[PDB]
Amino acid sequence: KRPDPMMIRWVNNKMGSVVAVPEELLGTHAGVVFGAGP
Amino acid sequence: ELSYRQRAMYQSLRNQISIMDTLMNLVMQFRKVCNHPDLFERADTSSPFFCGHFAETGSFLREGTNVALGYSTRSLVEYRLPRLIWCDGGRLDKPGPGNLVAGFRSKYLNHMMNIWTPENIRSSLEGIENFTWLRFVDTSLQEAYRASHTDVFARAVDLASKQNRLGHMQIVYDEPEDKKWTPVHALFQICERENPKAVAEITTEGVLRDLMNIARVKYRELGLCRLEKAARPRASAPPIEVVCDSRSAVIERENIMFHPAMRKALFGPTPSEIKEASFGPRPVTLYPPRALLPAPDHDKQRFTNITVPSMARFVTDSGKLAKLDELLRELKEGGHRVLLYFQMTRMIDLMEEYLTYRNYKY
Amino acid sequence: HRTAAHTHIKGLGLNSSGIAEKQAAGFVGQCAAREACGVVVDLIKAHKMAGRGVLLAGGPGTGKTALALAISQELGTKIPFCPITGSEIYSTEVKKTEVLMENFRRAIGLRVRETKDVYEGEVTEMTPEEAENPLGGYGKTISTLLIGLKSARGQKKLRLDPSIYEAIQKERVQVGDVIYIETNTGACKRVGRSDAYATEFDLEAEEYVPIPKGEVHKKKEIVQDVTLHDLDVANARPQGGQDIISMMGQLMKPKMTEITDKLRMEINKVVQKYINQGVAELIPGVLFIDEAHMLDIECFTYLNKALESPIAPIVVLASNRGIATIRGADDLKAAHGIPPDFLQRLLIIPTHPYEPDEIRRIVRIRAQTEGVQLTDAAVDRVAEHGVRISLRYCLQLLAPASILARVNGRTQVDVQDIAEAEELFLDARRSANILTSTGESGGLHGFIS
Amino acid sequence: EGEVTEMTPEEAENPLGGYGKTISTLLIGLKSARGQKKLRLDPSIYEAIQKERVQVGDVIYIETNTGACKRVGRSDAYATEFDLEAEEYVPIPKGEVHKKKEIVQDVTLHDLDVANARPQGGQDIISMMGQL
Amino acid sequence: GACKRVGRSDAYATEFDLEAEEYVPIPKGEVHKKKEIVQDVTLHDLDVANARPQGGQDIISMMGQL
Amino acid sequence: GLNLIAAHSHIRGLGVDADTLEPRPSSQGLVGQEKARKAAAVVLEMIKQGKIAGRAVLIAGPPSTGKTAIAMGMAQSLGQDVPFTTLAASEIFSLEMSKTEALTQAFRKSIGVRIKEESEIMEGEVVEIQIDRSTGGAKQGKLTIKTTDMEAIYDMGSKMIDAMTKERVMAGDIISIDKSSGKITKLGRSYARSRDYDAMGVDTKFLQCPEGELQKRKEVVHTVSLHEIDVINSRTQGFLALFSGDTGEIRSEIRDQINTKVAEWKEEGKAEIVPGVLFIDEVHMLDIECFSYINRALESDLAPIVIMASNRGVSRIRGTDYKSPHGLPLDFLDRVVIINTHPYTPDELRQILSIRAQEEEVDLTPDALALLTKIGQEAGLRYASNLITTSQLIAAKRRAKQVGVEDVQRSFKLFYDPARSVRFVQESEKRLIGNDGVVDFSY
Amino acid sequence: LIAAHSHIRGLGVDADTLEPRPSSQGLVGQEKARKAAAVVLEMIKQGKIAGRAVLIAGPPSTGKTAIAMGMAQSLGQDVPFTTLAASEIFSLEMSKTEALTQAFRKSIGVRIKEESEIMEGEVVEIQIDRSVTGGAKQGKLTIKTTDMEAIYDMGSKMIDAMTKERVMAGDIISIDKSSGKITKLGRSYARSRDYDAMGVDTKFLQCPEGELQKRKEVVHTVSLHEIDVINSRTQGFLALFSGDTGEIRSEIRDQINTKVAEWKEEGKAEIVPGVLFIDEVHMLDIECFSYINRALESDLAPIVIMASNRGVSRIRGTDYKSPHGLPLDFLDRVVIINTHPYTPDELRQILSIRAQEEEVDLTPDALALLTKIGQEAGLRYASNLITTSQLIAAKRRAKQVGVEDVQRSFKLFYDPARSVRFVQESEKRLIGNDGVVDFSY
Numbered sequence A: 001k002r003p004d005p006m007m008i009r010w011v012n013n014k015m016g017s018v019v020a021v022p023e024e025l026l027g028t029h030a031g032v033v034f035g036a037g038p
Numbered sequence B: 001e002l003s004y005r006q007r008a009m010y011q012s013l014r015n016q017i018s019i020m021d022t023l024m025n026l027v028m029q030f031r032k033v034c035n036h037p038d039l040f041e042r043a044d045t046s047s048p049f050f051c052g053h054f055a056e057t058g059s060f061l062r063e064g065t066n067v068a069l070g071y072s073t074r075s076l077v078e079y080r081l082p083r084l085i086w087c088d089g090g091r092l093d094k095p096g097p098g099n100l101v102a103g104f105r106s107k108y109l110n111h112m113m114n115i116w117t118p119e120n121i122r123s124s125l126e127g128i129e130n131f132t133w134l135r136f137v138d139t140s141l142q143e144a145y146r147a148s149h150t151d152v153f154a155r156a157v158d159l160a161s162k163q164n165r166l167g168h169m170q171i172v173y174d175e176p177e178d179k180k181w182t183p184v185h186a187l188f189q190i191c192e193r194e195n196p197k198a199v200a201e202i203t204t205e206g207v208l209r210d211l212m213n214i215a216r217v218k219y220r221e222l223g224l225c226r227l228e229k230a231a232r233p234r235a236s237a238p239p240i241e242v243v244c245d246s247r248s249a250v251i252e253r254e255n256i257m258f259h260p261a262m263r264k265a266l267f268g269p270t271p272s273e274i275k276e277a278s279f280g281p282r283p284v285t286l287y288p289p290r291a292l293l294p295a296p297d298h299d300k301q302r303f304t305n306i307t308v309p310s311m312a313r314f315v316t317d318s319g320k321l322a323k324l325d326e327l328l329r330e331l332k333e334g335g336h337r338v339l340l341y342f343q344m345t346r347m348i349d350l351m352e353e354y355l356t357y358r359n360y361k362y
Numbered sequence C: 001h002r003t004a005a006h007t008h009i010k011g012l013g014l015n016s017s018g019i020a021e022k023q024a025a026g027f028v029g030q031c032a033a034r035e036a037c038g039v040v041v042d043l044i045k046a047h048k049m050a051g052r053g054v055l056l057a058g059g060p061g062t063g064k065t066a067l068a069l070a071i072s073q074e075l076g077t078k079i080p081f082c083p084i085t086g087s088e089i090y091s092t093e094v095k096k097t098e099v100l101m102e103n104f105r106r107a108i109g110l111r112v113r114e115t116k117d118v119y120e121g122e123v124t125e126m127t128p129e130e131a132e133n134p135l136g137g138y139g140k141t142i143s144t145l146l147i148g149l150k151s152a153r154g155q156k157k158l159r160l161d162p163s164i165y166e167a168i169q170k171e172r173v174q175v176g177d178v179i180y181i182e183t184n185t186g187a188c189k190r191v192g193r194s195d196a197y198a199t200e201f202d203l204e205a206e207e208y209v210p211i212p213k214g215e216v217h218k219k220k221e222i223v224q225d226v227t228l229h230d231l232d233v234a235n236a237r238p239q240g241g242q243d244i245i246s247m248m249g250q251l252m253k254p255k256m257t258e259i260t261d262k263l264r265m266e267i268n269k270v271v272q273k274y275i276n277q278g279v280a281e282l283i284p285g286v287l288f289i290d291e292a293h294m295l296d297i298e299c300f301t302y303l304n305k306a307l308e309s310p311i312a313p314i315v316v317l318a319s320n321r322g323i324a325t326i327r328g329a330d331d332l333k334a335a336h337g338i339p340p341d342f343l344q345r346l347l348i349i350p351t352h353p354y355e356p357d358e359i360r361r362i363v364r365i366r367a368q369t370e371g372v373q374l375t376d377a378a379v380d381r382v383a384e385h386g387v388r389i390s391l392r393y394c395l396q397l398l399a400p401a402s403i404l405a406r407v408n409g410r411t412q413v414d415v416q417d418i419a420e421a422e423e424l425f426l427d428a429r430r431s432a433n434i435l436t437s438t439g440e441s442g443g444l445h446g447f448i449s
Numbered sequence D: 001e002g003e004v005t006e007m008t009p010e011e012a013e014n015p016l017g018g019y020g021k022t023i024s025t026l027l028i029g030l031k032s033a034r035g036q037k038k039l040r041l042d043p044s045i046y047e048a049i050q051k052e053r054v055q056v057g058d059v060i061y062i063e064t065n066t067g068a069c070k071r072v073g074r075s076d077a078y079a080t081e082f083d084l085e086a087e088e089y090v091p092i093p094k095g096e097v098h099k100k101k102e103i104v105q106d107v108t109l110h111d112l113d114v115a116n117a118r119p120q121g122g123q124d125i126i127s128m129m130g131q132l
Numbered sequence E: 001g002a003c004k005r006v007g008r009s010d011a012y013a014t015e016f017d018l019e020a021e022e023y024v025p026i027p028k029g030e031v032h033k034k035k036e037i038v039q040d041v042t043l044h045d046l047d048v049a050n051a052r053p054q055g056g057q058d059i060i061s062m063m064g065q066l
Numbered sequence F: 001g002l003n004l005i006a007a008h009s010h011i012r013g014l015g016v017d018a019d020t021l022e023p024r025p026s027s028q029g030l031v032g033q034e035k036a037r038k039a040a041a042v043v044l045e046m047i048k049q050g051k052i053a054g055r056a057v058l059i060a061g062p063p064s065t066g067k068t069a070i071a072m073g074m075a076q077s078l079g080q081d082v083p084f085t086t087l088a089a090s091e092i093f094s095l096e097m098s099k100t101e102a103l104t105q106a107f108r109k110s111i112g113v114r115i116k117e118e119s120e121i122m123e124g125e126v127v128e129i130q131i132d133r134s135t136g137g138a139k140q141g142k143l144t145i146k147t148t149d150m151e152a153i154y155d156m157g158s159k160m161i162d163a164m165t166k167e168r169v170m171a172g173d174i175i176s177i178d179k180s181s182g183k184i185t186k187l188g189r190s191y192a193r194s195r196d197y198d199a200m201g202v203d204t205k206f207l208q209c210p211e212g213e214l215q216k217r218k219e220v221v222h223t224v225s226l227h228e229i230d231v232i233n234s235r236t237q238g239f240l241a242l243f244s245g246d247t248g249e250i251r252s253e254i255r256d257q258i259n260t261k262v263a264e265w266k267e268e269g270k271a272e273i274v275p276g277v278l279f280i281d282e283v284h285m286l287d288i289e290c291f292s293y294i295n296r297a298l299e300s301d302l303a304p305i306v307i308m309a310s311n312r313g314v315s316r317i318r319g320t321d322y323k324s325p326h327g328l329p330l331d332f333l334d335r336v337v338i339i340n341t342h343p344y345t346p347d348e349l350r351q352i353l354s355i356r357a358q359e360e361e362v363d364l365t366p367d368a369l370a371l372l373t374k375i376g377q378e379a380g381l382r383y384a385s386n387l388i389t390t391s392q393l394i395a396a397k398r399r400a401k402q403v404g405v406e407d408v409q410r411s412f413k414l415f416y417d418p419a420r421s422v423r424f425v426q427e428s429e430k431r432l433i434g435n436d437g438v439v440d441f442s443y
Numbered sequence G: 001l002i003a004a005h006s007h008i009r010g011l012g013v014d015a016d017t018l019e020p021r022p023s024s025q026g027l028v029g030q031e032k033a034r035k036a037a038a039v040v041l042e043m044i045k046q047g048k049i050a051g052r053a054v055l056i057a058g059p060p061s062t063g064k065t066a067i068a069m070g071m072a073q074s075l076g077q078d079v080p081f082t083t084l085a086a087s088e089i090f091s092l093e094m095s096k097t098e099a100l101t102q103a104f105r106k107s108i109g110v111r112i113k114e115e116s117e118i119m120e121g122e123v124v125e126i127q128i129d130r131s132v133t134g135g136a137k138q139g140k141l142t143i144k145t146t147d148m149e150a151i152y153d154m155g156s157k158m159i160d161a162m163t164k165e166r167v168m169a170g171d172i173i174s175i176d177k178s179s180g181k182i183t184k185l186g187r188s189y190a191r192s193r194d195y196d197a198m199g200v201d202t203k204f205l206q207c208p209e210g211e212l213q214k215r216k217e218v219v220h221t222v223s224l225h226e227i228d229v230i231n232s233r234t235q236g237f238l239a240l241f242s243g244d245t246g247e248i249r250s251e252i253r254d255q256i257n258t259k260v261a262e263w264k265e266e267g268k269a270e271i272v273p274g275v276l277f278i279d280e281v282h283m284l285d286i287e288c289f290s291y292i293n294r295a296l297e298s299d300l301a302p303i304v305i306m307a308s309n310r311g312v313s314r315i316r317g318t319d320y321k322s323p324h325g326l327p328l329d330f331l332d333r334v335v336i337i338n339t340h341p342y343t344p345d346e347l348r349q350i351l352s353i354r355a356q357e358e359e360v361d362l363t364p365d366a367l368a369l370l371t372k373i374g375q376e377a378g379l380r381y382a383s384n385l386i387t388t389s390q391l392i393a394a395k396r397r398a399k400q401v402g403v404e405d406v407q408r409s410f411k412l413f414y415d416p417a418r419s420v421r422f423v424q425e426s427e428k429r430l431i432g433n434d435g436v437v438d439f440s441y
C-alpha cells in the first residue's frame, strides 16, 4: 500500500527514530524543513 | 426479588386487579415482567421530551434509498411580527427607506465621531492625552480599533492566532546581562512578562506544574468524567423564532441563528482548506486556525442528552437474570455450558443477546 | 431503608367511607384532621379544581407535616407532589415571586405521548461536500454531508444538512461507527464501533456494539412525564437545536431567569394543542408550602393573583404560630402569621395536641419502626416524656437507648438504658436551666449573651 | 537557547519504503552571546519547527522535558534585512547556549487557589472569551 | 454606505412558478434622489457608541446573561 | 381542558346594559355591586373610546367585595380588541431591573400598535411532488396541488425545493405556503390518501381537502405593544428576552426613538395606536418611590388607563413611616378617582353561591343552599364557596346525587372558617408559638 | 505545623463499653459529654438513622470543638465530615437555603465501584502519523512483557498523552485503558546517546511480567453535591472546585435522589452518610433554622452536630431571645450535650498534652504556675504562654522552660481580663462608643 499523501510518519525503536515524508509533500512548503521544498 | 424496574411496572399493572375482574390476561403479563421487563417494554436509546415542531416521515416504503435530511427543528412557540416592525424600519439599527436615521448614525457614531478610529487616536497619542499609554500596550492603533468594534467572540477568535511571546522571553532573558529585557512597546504588560505559569511548564521537576493542575486532575481521577449521568432535563426545545412573511426575515434568521463565521470558528477549517494549506508551495495561515469548540467535560455524554441502554442495566433489570448471572458464572466454573428452558419464546432472544454480550456459549 | 421522622407514616388510614380509623397506616389520632386531609385528596384526584388553598394549623409537633406527607402517599407517584419551605423562596438569582411561579408550574404535571423519528446504522460512508463562499473572510463552508448508514435490513444513504453534520462532527463520528440520528432535534449520538473489526488491540477502550437490527429508519413512540415548568425552562434556555444559540447555550453557565407571563401563557396554548391532539393527559398536582409563616406580605399578595390563575395547583400551607407579626409588615399582626386577606381564601384544618395514651401508641409504633424492641416498662418510661417534655424528645431517645442497651449486651431496651439516655441527652428545658443557673453571672466560665 | 545558526536534516541509513525521504536526525546550530553549539535533535522536532515557523536567524529555545521548541522572535542581527518587515526583533540570548539552573519560585497558597480555580492558558473559545 | 435589498423585481416573478422569494415592482421615481436631513444626536449617544460595540457589531449579545 | 374551574371562572363580562350603562340586577355572572359595575362600565366606555389618556381609577372596599371580579369582568368585556395587562404589585420587585423600570415596562405593555398587512397564501392537497435531486440536489422539480375546485402544476425554484424537502412534503399532504417567506406548514393529511401514510400510527388524524382557490390574499391584523418594540430593539435577538425575561433596564433613548417612529407610523397611516389597560392588583404593595414615578408616567401621552384595587384602610405607606388612606400617599390619591365596593346582602350571597354552584358541577338541595347562605353571612362568601366543593366531595363519598345538609354540616365541621380559626388560635396560645418565640411542648 | 487541636487523635473511649477514659487519645475530662458523643459516633457509623441533630453546648473553651474534632478523627477519612462555620452560609452567589442544601449534600457520600483495566509493558516501538496543518493523528504502539508482544492502535487523545509524556522505546509505561491516563514507570534500556535534549533518565526497571492487560477493581467516593454539580450542567465542572455553581434546580436533585437509590438497588453504589458539623450555629438566621428543621426530615439528611457558646441570647433576624440563641421549635428537634469547665487537675493534664505536642520541656513549677494561670486567665491563654515561654527560654539558651520564662511571658502578654482592666484604666485615651477621644498627654 502506497502511503498517505499528507500523513508524515515518525517511528522510534531501538535504532533511535526517523521521520519519513510522503512524496506528495516533497516540493511543498512542508518539504522545506527536510531539504525538499519547492 | 423483583428489580425496581420490574417492581414498578408489575405493581402498576397488578393494581388493575382492583379495577377489573381479564385475570388470565393480567397474570400472563405478571409472568412476562417477572421473567424480564424487556419482554414487556424494551429498553432502548432515549432522550428528553422535545417541545418542538419537526417534519415527520409519512411513509418508509415511498422514501427510497437516497433521502435529504433537512434541519426541520423549529419552536412551537412562535412570535408573529409584521414586516413593518421586523423589516421595514421598526428595527432602529436597520438602515433603509423609512429608517433614515440608522445609516447616518452608524457612520458617525461608529467611525467619524468615534474615538477609537486611528485618525482620532493618533491625535491623542502624546503627553497627558487619553491614548498616551498605547505606545506601551502591545496593540497597534489598528488592533485597538478592531478590539473596540468587534464583539467578545470575534476578539476571542483573534486571540486564537497569537503567540504568548512574552512568556517565552521569561525563559530566555533571565540573567543580569539580559536585564530582564522586554520590548519597550510591551513595557506595560508586566504580568505577562513576569508570571510563574511559564516557568513551571519548563522546569523538569513538575512540582509547581502539578500544584497548578490539582483541580483538573482530581476531577478526572474521581471518575466524574466517566460516571453515568444521574440527571438530564426532562424537556428540551429549540430557540423561539420570529415568524415574518418576508424573505429578508428568512435571510436574517440564517445569518444570525445559523451564523456562518461563529460556526466556522467553532468547528475549524474545512477539509479542502486543509488540503490547500498542506499542499501549498508556501505556508498559509488558516482560519480559525483550529476548532475552537471546547472539549466536553463529560468524556462520554459529550454535547447531547441522549442515553443508550447499558447491558449491565439490562442484566440487573431482571431479578431472575441478576440472580442467574451469579449461578451461570458458578455453573461455568462448575464446567457446564449454558442450557436453559423457557416458557416464553421471546425470552430466548433476550438470552441470545445476553450471551452474545457475555460471550458465554450455549 | 434509612429511618427518618416519618418512615412510619404510610397514608391517611381512612375507611372507604372517609372516616378515620383511630390507629391506621402509622397514625394515632388527629382523626378529624386526617378526615379533612382525605377530602383534600379527593379534591386533588378530581382534576376539576384549580387554586384552592388549605392551611394545616396547629402547634409544633402536632403532625402537620406527617399529614402532608401522608397526602403525598395517598396521591401516589403519578400526581405531582411539590414540597417547599417558605425559606426556599428568597433566591439570589431571581425575584421571590418567580420561585413561587416555578413551584406553581412544577406542581402541574403532563403525561404526553412522543414519537421519536430516527435513523440508526453503521456509518459505511461519510463524504463532505462544500462551496467556496464569496469573501466573507471565514473561508470555505461545508454545503452538505453524504453519509451511508447500514442496518440489518439493508442500508440507506443520507445527504445531511450541514447543521446536522455539525452534530455528527461534535459527536466525533467516524466511518465504521454505529450512530443514532434523531430527526426531531437534528441531534446525534455515537453508539459505538461496529462489532465488525472488533479486535482487542485498541487503547481507545471502544465499546463495540452490534449492528442495529431492523430497518435503518425507525419511528418509535414513547410516553414522557413532564411538568409545565420543564417546558418553561426548555423554552427559556433553548438547548435542543443545532443552531448557534442552542450550541452556545450549552457552553454558558446555567442560570435561572425571570420567565415571563408571556412565555407561560404561550406554553398553555402549546400544551392545550397536545391535549386536543390527544397526545397528552393533564395531571394537576399539589404544592405543599411548609413553614408558610416564613413567607412575606409580598409572597402572600402574589399568591392572591397566582391562585386566581385559570390553572393552578392546590396549595397546602402549614403554620405553627399564634397571633404573630407578618414578615415584611411589622405593622400587621394576625393569627397563623398569615395576612387576614389571604386567610379568608383558605380552608383551615386545625390540628391538636396528643393525649398521653396516643403518645404511648406513637412511641410503640416508632420503636418497632426503628426496630427498637422495647419493654413495656421502658415504653411507659419514654411515654412519661412527651407528656412532661415534647413528643419529639421521646422519639429521639429511642436510638441512644438502643445503642446503650446493645453496648450493655442487652437484646432489648430496659428502663436503665433510657435513664442513661435521659442523662447523656438533655431536652431544651433542662439545658435552658443550665444556662440560667451557670450564666447567672458573667465571668470566665459564663455563657455568652 | 540561541539564534538558529542552521537547520539541516541528516538522511537516514534505512529509509522507509514508499516515502523517498527519511531523516534520522535534524541538526540545529544555536548561537548565544557566550558561544554556539552544534545540536543533534530527534527528528520529531520538525513538528514544532513547522508549526512555530522557526527559521535561520530566529531566536528559539529547546526545552528538554518535551523536546519541543518555541520561538521568541527574529534575531536583531537581521533587523536590517529589509526596509520593512512586520515583526520586532529580539536580542541574541546573553546567557549560555545551554542553561541548567536551579530556580526558586515564590508562591503563595492563594496563587494555587486561583491557578486551579481559573486556569489561564485554555485555548478554547470559552476560556479565551473568559480571559477577555 | 448603508444598503438594503428591497426585494426581487417582479419582472422576474415568473422565473419560476413557485419560489421562496419576495417580488416587488420596479422603482418608479428617479433612480437617484438627493435629500438633506438635519440629524440630531446627543453626547450620551456618543458615550454609548464609544463605550461598547453596538447593534450588529455585537451578535453574541443574543446569548443574554453576561 | 387546560382551564380548570377557578374562583372567577363564572365571570363572563360586566353584566351591564350596553345601551345605557344601567347594570342589570344580575347578568353575565355578576350579582349586585351595581353602582361599582356602572362606574367600571363608564371606565370601560372611555377605555374603548381611547381619546382619554393616563387616568387612574382605584377600586376600594373590604376583602371579598368583588374588586377583582369587577376587574375580571372588564377584561372579559374588553377581549382581544384592547391590551389588558394584569400586575400584582409584588411583581415589580425584580432582581433583574429596578422597580421603576419594571413599572415602565408594565406601562409599555399596555399600549398596542395595530398593524394591518396582507400576503398571498397558497393552500391545497399535494397531488404529487417530483424532485430530481440530480450527487447534487435541488436541481429541478414540479408540484401539483389541488383544492376541491381546482388543480394546478408549478415549477419550483431551487430554494423552494429545499423548503419542500425540509418539510418532507409528500403526496396527500395538505399544506399552506406563505409565498413571500416560503415557509410550508402541513395542515394535515388528506383522508383520501390515508392508505399511503404507512409510517403514521393509527392515532393520526386526517382532513378533508381544502376549498376555493389555491391562492388568495389573507389579511393579518397584528397588534404589537410598545414594550415589544422596545425589547426587540435592545439586542440582536431582543424579542428572545420577551419570553425568558433577561431584559436589562432598556435605555431611555431607545424608547424615545420608538415613540417618535410610532408617531410617524400613525401620521403616515401605516399603524393605529391602541391604548390598553394596566390593572394593578393590591396597589398598596407599591412603595413611595413607585407612586412618585406613576404620578408622571400617567402624564405621558402614551399612557394606558390604570385601574387599581386596595383592601387597606388608613395604613402605613411602604418605604416610609407614616399612614394614609388605602396606604397610598395623598399626592398620588389626588390623581385618582375611587370606586367603592360594599358588602353583600344575604340574597346576593345566595345568588353568588348559586352561580358558583352552577360553575362547579354541583347540585344543591334548597336547604343546603339556605345553610350555605347562612354560613356565608356568618363566615364570609369565600368560605361558603369553598364548602361547595367540599360538600360535593363528601356527597360523592356517600354516593349521593345531590348535596344535602349532612354534607354541608360535615364540611363546616371538618374545615374551620377564619373566625373559628382565630378562636382556636386564641385558645391554643401556649401550644402555638407566640410573637415572643415562646412555646410549651408539654401536655 | 501544630494547630489548636492537633493533639486530639480520637474520642478516648473504650470501643466496647463506650466508657470514657479520664484521659486518652489527647482528650481529658468531659466524660459525660464524651460518652454522649460516643453514642452519637456509633449511630453515625451504623448509618441506619438519618437526620439526628445533636447540639454540643457549653461556655467558651471546655472542648466542644475538641470533642467534634475527636469524633472526626475516629471516623477516619472514609466517612464524610463536612466542617461548616455558620458564617459561610451568607453567600452572595447563592441564597442561605441553597448554601445549606449544598452543605447537607456534601455530607452524604456515594461510594462507587468500577472495574478498570490496565496495561503494564515495555514499549518496543512507537509510530505516529500526523496530518500537516493539524487535525487528524494516527499511530501504533508496540508494547511488551517478558511473555507477550502486541500492537495497539492509538487515537488522537492517546497520542496527545504519549507525546505529552514523551513516551519512547525502552520506557516502561502503564496505561489505565478506562481513563486513558499514562505514567512512565521507568526504563529498561539505557538512555541513548545519538540525540541531545532527551532529558532525564528515569528509574531502571526490569520488564514487566505476565499478561499485558489486567483488570483492576477500584472504588471512588463522591458526594451527592458533586453528582449534583456535574448533572446540572453540560460544561464547566470546575464548579466542583471554583464554587461557581449557582442555585441548582430541585428537578436535578429529585432525579439524582431517585437515581442514587436505583444505583444502591443495583449494587453499583453504597451510600455512606456522614456528619455535617455546624460550628457557631447561633450565627444562623431564623430563615436558616426553619430550613434545617425540615431538611433534617429527609431520608438522605446527614447527622447534624452543632456547637454554641451562647446563653439565653437574641436570635439573629428577629426581635427576641432564646436559649443558645436557637429557636425553641428548632431546639425541640435537638438532643443537647453540655460540656463543663475544667478542674485544675484537668487543666494540668491538658497543658501537659499541649506542652508535649509543642515538644516543650516544662519544669514542674512552670507547669504548676501555668496551671494557676490556667485557673484565673484561662486554658487558651495558658496554652499561648507555653510556646511564648519556649521562645523566651531560647533567648536565654535555657534547656527547659523555667518559672522565670512563664513569668516573663505573663508580663509581656496580657490575658483577656487584664486587657479589659487596661481598657477601663485608659477609657480617656481609647476611642469610646461615642467616638470621642483625647489625644493629649
Ligand SMILES: Nc1ncnc2c1ncn2[C@@H]1O[C@H](COP(=O)(O)OP(=O)(O)O)[C@@H](O)[C@H]1O
Pocket (backbone or CB within 6 Å): C005, C006, C009, C026, C027, C028, C029, C030, C058, C059, C060, C061, C062, C063, C064, C065, C066, C067, C320, C362, C365, C391, C392, C395
Ligand atoms: N398522629 C400521629 N401518628 C404517628 N406519628 C405522628 C403523629 N403525629 C406526629 N407524628 C410524628 O411525630 C413527629 C413530629 O411530627 P411533625 O409532623 O414533625 O409535627 P409538626 O410538623 O407539626 O412540627 C414526626 O416523627 C411525626 O411522624
Ligand SMILES: Nc1ncnc2c1ncn2[C@@H]1O[C@H](COP(=O)(O)OP(=O)(O)O)[C@@H](O)[C@H]1O
Pocket (backbone or CB within 6 Å): F007, F008, F011, F029, F030, F031, F032, F033, F061, F062, F063, F064, F065, F066, F067, F068, F069, F070, F352, F355, F381, F382
Ligand atoms: N358581585 C359578584 N358577582 C359574582 N361573583 C362575585 C361577586 N363578588 C365576588 N364574587 C366572587 O367571590 C370571590 C371573592 O370576590 P373577589 O372579587 O375576589 O373580592 P376581592 O377582590 O375584593 O377580594 C371571587 O371568587 C369572586 O369571583
Ligand SMILES: Nc1ncnc2c1ncn2[C@@H]1O[C@H](COP(=O)(O)OP(=O)(O)O)[C@@H](O)[C@H]1O
Pocket (backbone or CB within 6 Å): G004, G005, G006, G008, G026, G027, G028, G029, G030, G059, G060, G061, G062, G063, G064, G065, G066, G067, G350, G353, G379, G380
Ligand atoms: N478535654 C480537652 N482535652 C484536650 N484539649 C482540650 C480539651 N478541651 C479543650 N482543649 C483545647 O483547648 C482549646 C479550647 O478548646 P475548644 O475545643 O476550642 O473550645 P470551644 O468549645 O470554645 O471550641 C483548644 O486548643 C482545644 O484543643
